[PDB]
Symmetry: C2
Subunit: 313 residues, 2 copies
């Protein structure tokens, strides 16, 4: 009964494969249509993440061996532990968190963008392994894995977020997904930024920057999709979601402070890494469309560290 | 006399994240350990699939325009429909089938190999889109999407496999996943190879060969993991699984014959594409460790087609 001829009527008469599977094997399934992109932001993001493909073997980490050998065994242990803990977060994102966003998608193109995210964060975990292969001894590697499984403050950050990935609530799942690359990343990234400012491990620093380039987009994209769904909710449901975001973030900030104090206690870096972490919590809120409540002193970052965001050593 | 006298013990004291969720949020979670690979085959496959990364910008598809313009509207429509049907299979693999194998994995490294498979088959679907953007009118593209959703013989092939991806039986899910790149692909791939053997759409067939290079590994790897797990099961369960594989493959073959007859009906290609399909069904069985029951007559492929199928894929780098 329409007086205009709407193009692509087949789309409204069909379902994506995941929708077919979720709704009890009902409906006619449509192929993705890369010639009709429902949200142009999806095409922009697909193009940037695929143009940004890299693998760790492209960076000659072996050229860091002399720099690595200037670090005491205590510093080498700290780096192996910190990076292995980040590898755990990468593993959760690749195998649970990002793949859980596929069925939560607003568009067919978003469904496969999250498969790229999952694969690329697996590459991030691969690259930590690659760094260790070149620089670390077998004993250093194994001891870091045993420390990861046995450090309760580390385990608790992951345990707090994983339950949301059931997609019992898709928006809560998306917030918990974005908190990995948008927040928990940074307490650990403080360490390579600190080492880079001191002229250590330049080639490893190149891998850290490639990882950062991907993670920034992952956080941005989830926040973009969070805001798009939330704006369509009732004012009441939007208030409930905003209180959820602040509550979960504050909970994760407390868990992260406890973890970073343990990780960096012997080195004095915990207070600086916590302010750096809380600064990025403020940006995480902005990424979801909210205002940062954090103070300047809460979030103060030295310039040699702050620029990389884009006698006593 | 003599003096009376375990590496990586943490691994047995912990679980992977997907397990931790599976076990009801119980256990200590371990990071993937790329320095201690439990099955070296996983490192080999990770290295192969990542070094084979490509995007459709690698291929100068616009150089096919002269030969595309020599095809009739009916042939152009056949090509667009066939490829859009393949894009549906790609979409199912990227968003349902390959994702579903992550929790079925025997090792931590296999979990992330299947995330590569899902993304790369998404690239396959995007590549079809690139071909359509270069060659097809907006009307041809939309017609093909409307034909895909409304063609029951096409839909039935997908509907037969998707229920297994719920993972009630992880081995049945894995077989049903592998049937996509290992079998359902080939009836459609017959068309570009038929065309390029006749000098039509040569650059498009270069895309097809890059897709094939990935799909072959996806099928091989699922068959490797299938065999590894099945080999540890009771003789009764192994024979049950063999019967399941043959029963499902034969039912898929029947659905594929019905679809290819409908798809190719005005063109005379269905009988040839069906033999090409059944040839690859035989290879599918061999890849799971079984013997092919199909005759030489059921599986004949002409040399010019085999030449296109077997040609190697390739200053632009990734
Ligand atoms: Ca300090
Ligand atoms: Ca014929």
């Amino acid at each position: 009964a329409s007086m205009a001829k709407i193009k692509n009527q087949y789309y409204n008469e069909s379902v994506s494969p995941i929708e077919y599977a979720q709704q009890g094997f009902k409906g006619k399934m449509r192929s993705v249509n890369w010639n009709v992109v429902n949200d142009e932001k999806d095409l922009e993001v697909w193009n940037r993440i695929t143009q940004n493909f890299w693998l760790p073997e492209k960076i000659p980490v072996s050229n860091d061996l002399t720099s690595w050998r200037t670090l005491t065994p205590e510093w080498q242990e700290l780096i192996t532990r910190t990076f292995t803990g980040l590898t755990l977060l990468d593993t959760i994102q690749a195998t649970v968190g990002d793949v859980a966003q596929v069925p939560n998608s607003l568009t067919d193109h978003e469904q496969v963008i999250y498969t790229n995210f999952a694969f690329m964060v697996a590459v991030h975990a691969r690259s930590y392994g690659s760094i260790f292969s070149t620089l670390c001894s077998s004993e250093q590697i194994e001891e870091a894995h045993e420390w990861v499984i046995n450090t309760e403050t580390l385990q608790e950050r992951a345990k707090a977020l994983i339950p949301y990935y059931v997609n019992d609530d898709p928006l809560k799942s998306k917030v918990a997904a974005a908190l990995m690359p948008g927040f928990l990343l940074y307490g650990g990234f403080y360490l390579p930024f600190y080492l880079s400012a001191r002229g250590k491990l330049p080639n490893t620093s190149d891998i850290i920057r490639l990882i950062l380039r991907d993670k920034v987009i992952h956080n941005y994209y989830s926040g973009y999709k969070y805001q798009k769904k939330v704006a369509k909710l009732s004012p009441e449901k939007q208030a409930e979601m905003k209180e959820f975001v602040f509550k979960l973030l504050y909970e994760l900030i407390d868990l992260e402070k406890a973890y970073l104090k343990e990780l960096y206690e012997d080195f004095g870096l915990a207070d600086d890494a916590i302010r750096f972490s809380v600064y990025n919590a403020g940006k995480f809120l902005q990424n979801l469309g909210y205002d940062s409540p954090f103070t300047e002193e809460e979030t103060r970052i030295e310039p040699e560290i702050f620029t990389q965001l884009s006698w006593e050593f």
